Amino acid sequence: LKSIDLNIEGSKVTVKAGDIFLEPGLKAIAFNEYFDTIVNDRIISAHSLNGTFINLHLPSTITQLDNHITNYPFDSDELSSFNKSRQEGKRQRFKIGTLCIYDDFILTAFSKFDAQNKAVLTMPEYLEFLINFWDKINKVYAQQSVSTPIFGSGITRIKEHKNITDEDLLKIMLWTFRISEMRFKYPAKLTIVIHKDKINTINLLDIKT
Amino acid sequence: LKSIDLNIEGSKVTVKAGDIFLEPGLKAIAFNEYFDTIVNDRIISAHSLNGTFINLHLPSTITQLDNHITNYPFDSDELSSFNKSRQEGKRQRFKIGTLCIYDDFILTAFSKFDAQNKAVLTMPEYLEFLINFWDKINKVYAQQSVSTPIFGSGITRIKEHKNITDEDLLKIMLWTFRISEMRFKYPAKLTIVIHKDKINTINLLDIKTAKNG
Ligand SMILES: Nc1ncnc2c1ncn2[C@@H]1O[C@H](COP(=O)(O)OP(=O)(O)OC[C@H]2O[C@@H](n3ccnc3)[C@H](O)[C@@H]2O)[C@@H](O)[C@H]1O
Ligand SMILES: Nc1ncnc2c1ncn2[C@@H]1O[C@H](COP(=O)(O)OP(=O)(O)OC[C@H]2O[C@@H](n3ccnc3)[C@H](O)[C@@H]2O)[C@@H](O)[C@H]1O
């Protein structure tokens, strides 16, 4: 599958097949509303990018990742509620779309956590995430390369849209980025990375044309 | 071009120039989070459709509209907070997208109210309104005609997007309607009405492309 370059209001967006961990430069990884780091059968799934990052791709150790999040200078505006009775995992919730920068990784609070489904969003929350994320990346990383996977196409359950396709999520990513970037003179330089294992599942012809 | 029919995932959506008040059938009108009805220089503007509705197009009187809202069977999950201290206007807030049906009008809680800016939304709240509104309309008014104006293209200030174009809001309406309707076997039959005075600011051929998402 050949990379495609889209002209979106003067700005180039690239959609390519590959492996997010091989991208040079900033790489976005979806964490949850707690920035959880425990990978097991109850909290973060090793089948997710959040889990694969922790298991196989950290800058150093889990301890150092935990300390980085604990000591990170979050704005007070980014703190949401505190979940005092949570029996396992972290307790501070963060507002959807919040970033935590760690070397060449943009960690972001993407899904909300639920015991049974682990990763849930409503469709309005999915759109809120995207606008908040794109607005932050276009402010802080103007004119810089940022690579992202297709948000929401893993284990996340988007309420009432359980079988939304990867292609439809990619289209939502593209028009929400267009909305965000239209108010910035110099947006981020976005690349969306489709996992090579899923390339023939995604019909890119709608996107390309 | 004054009118186009779009095939959005198997369902016809019409976009046309016209006057919402002449539509036969259900007509959506954007009210605010309180369903306010006072039209003056402080609360609802007569320049808005909310105001033109109240001033010129009610089923009967303002008193009967107020009673209708007061006695309406809202569900518990549609209530937001109560603004005990508000000095003018209604005090019960409703969740964005809440509907109040009144004869052939779908009144909906669209913008949030600010003393100074009067009508405000963030862009996430605008998208949440649209998804919530289309989901409600597609559930309750499946296979029925529903006409809407271009939401947000009047006096509403969408934070950080003060000059977003009517065409871009129309495309957002179409993209979000497609997302909503893709989960319903029989969606509402949507018509979006562009005011005859603004049709030349919208290229309906550009608009056709949004049927693909
Ligand atoms: N190397 C690689 N290169 C490029 N693409 C890759 C890839 N490997 C996989 N893909 C694909 O990328 C897309 C996104 O995958 P993710 O797994 O990020 O799913 P997503 O639904 O966005 O988020 C999951 C949410 O669940 C939370 N959670 C809760 C419990 N455990 C996790 C998380 O904290 C998060 O919030 C999918 O298409 C994956 O195949
Ligand atoms: N006959 C007609 N046929 C068809 N199109 C017509 C039309 N006449 C006007 N148009 C156009 O329709 C679009 C939408 O117009 P609206 O005025 O509804 O603007 P909107 O920004 O969506 O909402 C305003 C929000 O401010 C709140 N508010 C606060 C104080 N006063 C009001 C309200 O409660 C609401 O929440 C614009 O393009 C109008 O030209």
Numbering used by the authors:
A (entry chain B): 65 to 273
B (entry chain A): 65 to 277
Sentences from the paper on this structure:
The Thoeris defense system triggers abortive infection (Abi) upon phage detection. The ThsB genes encode Toll/interleukin-1 receptor (TIR) domain–containing proteins responsible for phage detection, while the ThsA gene encodes an Abi-triggering effector protein.
Unexpectedly, in the final map, we observed unambiguous electron density for an adenine dinucleotide with the distal ribose linked to a five-membered ring in the ligand binding pocket. Liquid chromatography–mass spectrometry (LC-MS) revealed that the PcThsAMacro bound nucleotide has a mass corresponding to IAD. Although both PcThsAMacro and EcThsAMacro were purified using the same method with imidazole-containing buffers, IAD only copurified with PcThsAMacro. We show that IAD is a considerably stronger (~30-fold) ThsAMacro ligand than ADPR. The ADPR/IAD binding sites are located at the dimer-dimer interfaces, but neither ADPR nor IAD is directly involved in subunit interactions. In both structures, the N termini of the macro domains are localized on the same side of these linear assemblies, which is compatible with oligomerization along the two-dimensional surface of the bacterial cell membrane.
